[PDB]
Amino acid sequence: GPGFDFAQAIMKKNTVVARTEKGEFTMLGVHDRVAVIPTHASVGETIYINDVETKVLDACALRDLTDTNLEITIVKLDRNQKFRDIRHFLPRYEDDYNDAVLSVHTSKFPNMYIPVGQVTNYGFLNLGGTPTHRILMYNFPTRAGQCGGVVTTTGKVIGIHVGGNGAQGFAAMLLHSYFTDTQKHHHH
Amino acid sequence: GPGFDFAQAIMKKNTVVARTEKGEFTMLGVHDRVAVIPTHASVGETIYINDVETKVLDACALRDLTDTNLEITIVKLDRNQKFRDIRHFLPRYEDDYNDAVLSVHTSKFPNMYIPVGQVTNYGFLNLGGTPTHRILMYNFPTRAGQCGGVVTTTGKVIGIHVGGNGAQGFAAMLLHSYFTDTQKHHHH
Numbered sequence: 481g482p483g484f485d486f487a488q489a490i491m492k493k494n495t496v497v498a499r500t501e502k503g504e505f506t507m508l509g510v511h512d513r514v515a516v517i518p519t520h521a522s523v524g525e526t527i528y529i530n531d532v533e534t535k536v537l538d539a540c541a542l543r544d545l546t547d548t549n550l551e552i553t554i555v556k557l558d559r560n561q562k563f564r565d566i567r568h569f570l571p572r573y574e575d576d577y578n579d580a581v582l583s584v585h586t587s588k589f590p591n592m593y594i595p596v597g598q599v600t601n602y603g604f605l606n607l608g609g610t611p612t613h614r615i616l617m618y619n620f621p622t623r624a625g626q627c628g629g630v631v632t633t634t635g636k637v638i639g640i641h642v643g644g645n646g647a648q649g650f651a652a653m654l655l656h657s658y659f660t661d662t663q664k665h666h667h668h
Numbered sequence: 669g670p671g672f673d674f675a676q677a678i679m680k681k682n683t684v685v686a687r688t689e690k691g692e693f694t695m696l697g698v699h700d701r702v703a704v705i706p707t708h709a710s711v712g713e714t715i716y717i718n719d720v721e722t723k724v725l726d727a728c729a730l731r732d733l734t735d736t737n738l739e740i741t742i743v744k745l746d747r748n749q750k751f752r753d754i755r756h757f758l759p760r761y762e763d764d765y766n767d768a769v770l771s772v773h774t775s776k777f778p779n780m781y782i783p784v785g786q787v788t789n790y791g792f793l794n795l796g797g798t799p800t801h802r803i804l805m806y807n808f809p810t811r812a813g814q815c816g817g818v819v820t821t822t823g824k825v826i827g828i829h830v831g832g833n834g835a836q837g838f839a840a841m842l843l844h845s846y847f848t849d850t851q852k853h854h855h856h
């Protein structure tokens with residue numbers, strides 16, 4: 481019994497449509513003015529958020545300690561509204577999951593929910609020719625237009641959709657420690 | 669709070685993918701080997717059901733007593749499996765509804781759910797140049813590929829999706845009396 485109600489609460493308060501030179505993506509807002517988007521979106525210095533041109537104050541394309549793409553880009557946005565803080569719904573650790581929902585919020589699909597079933601910690605993925613780590617996999621035929629879609633179970637936001645091979649879909653994990661209010665160094 | 673669980677139970681036991689010369693449509697099975705599909709599908713003497721070629725034993729393109737298109741075609745299929753009988757979930761009368769779900773089951777979207785919000789008894793619609801009666805309307809930007817999609821609230825199957833103008837979506841009603849085990853006359 482997929483957590484449709486939870487998915488819908490997340491979509492309603494915590495997603496916007498983002499558009500870059502690469503097209504539209506569902507965008508999950510995490511806290512304050514911080515959101516995520518797949519790294520293949522190629523975030524620049526500005527982005528459209530619900531068709532409003534918006535200054536990108538920071539964009540961090542995450543990579544692990546092997547210097548490998550994680551496919552998550554964290555963005556800080558110059559806008560007035562704060563996102564509801566949903567960090568407490570992010571998992572602490574890598575995990576497998578049951579009965580997940582993928583939800584999309586784009587111009588073409590402003591509110592759509594797809595039960596993808598079981599989600600497994602998959603690991604390595606050649607993503608459009610880019611070596612990528614920390615991938616989650618579900619046996620569902622996801623399509624173009626669903627990148628950035630949010631993967632939830634009840635009470636957890638576990639990843640965002642980034643790829644698919646026609647039979648399976650792939651999400652980059654979200655972990656709680658990606659967003660903890662932290663320390664000082666030169667990142668660009 | 670949309671009835672996602674109800675929608676999912678209907679999709680799981682009572683839909684198949686149907687494909688005609690016009691493309692793929694979600695197809696709702698109602699009872700025995702009787703199903704529905706939008707009249708614009710142009711059902712012939714055979715149809716594909718989950719990619720299996722299937723004899724169409726009867727196809728009745730419903731019209732009202734003004735001789736106007738209702739956009740429902742009832743089909744009787746030569747296949748082994750019986751549909752779970754869901755006639756008791758069909759409304760008796762025309763009505764307006766709250767918080768409906770539209771669900772799609774095609775090759776491209778084998779399982780997708782879209783909350784469309786309020787559903788109003790709309791009446792007349794010029795559907796792709798065909799005058800049509802008994803239409804339901806929802807303020808949601810439905811797209812090509814969603815025709816045949818099932819419109820539910822908890823406990824009722826109220827219509828199938830047939831059209832849209834980019835801002836609103838339109839479904840043809842289903843009424844309980846369309847499927848009551850009835851009497852004798854020449855219909856073709």
Ligand SMILES: *[C@@H](CC(=O)OCC)[C@H](C[C@@H]1CCNC1=O)NC(=O)OC(C)(C)C
Pocket residue numbers: 520607608609621622623624625626627628642643644645646649650
């Ligand atoms: C989401 C982004 C997209 O559609 O970009 C257009 C090129 C894509 C989702 C998968 C496409 C096929 N099925 C999917 O679930 N991801 C994507 O295209 O990844 C790259 C690496 C850009 C090819």
Ligand SMILES: *[C@@H](CC(=O)OCC)[C@H](C[C@@H]1CCNC1=O)NC(=O)OC(C)(C)C
Pocket residue numbers: 708795796797809810811812813814815816830831832833834837838
């Ligand atoms: C469903 C059938 C379809 O896609 O046929 C391809 C021509 C269509 C749904 C609407 C299209 C735009 N938005 C919709 O919600 N219905 C449709 O195209 O109706 C006709 C009468 C065939 C034009």
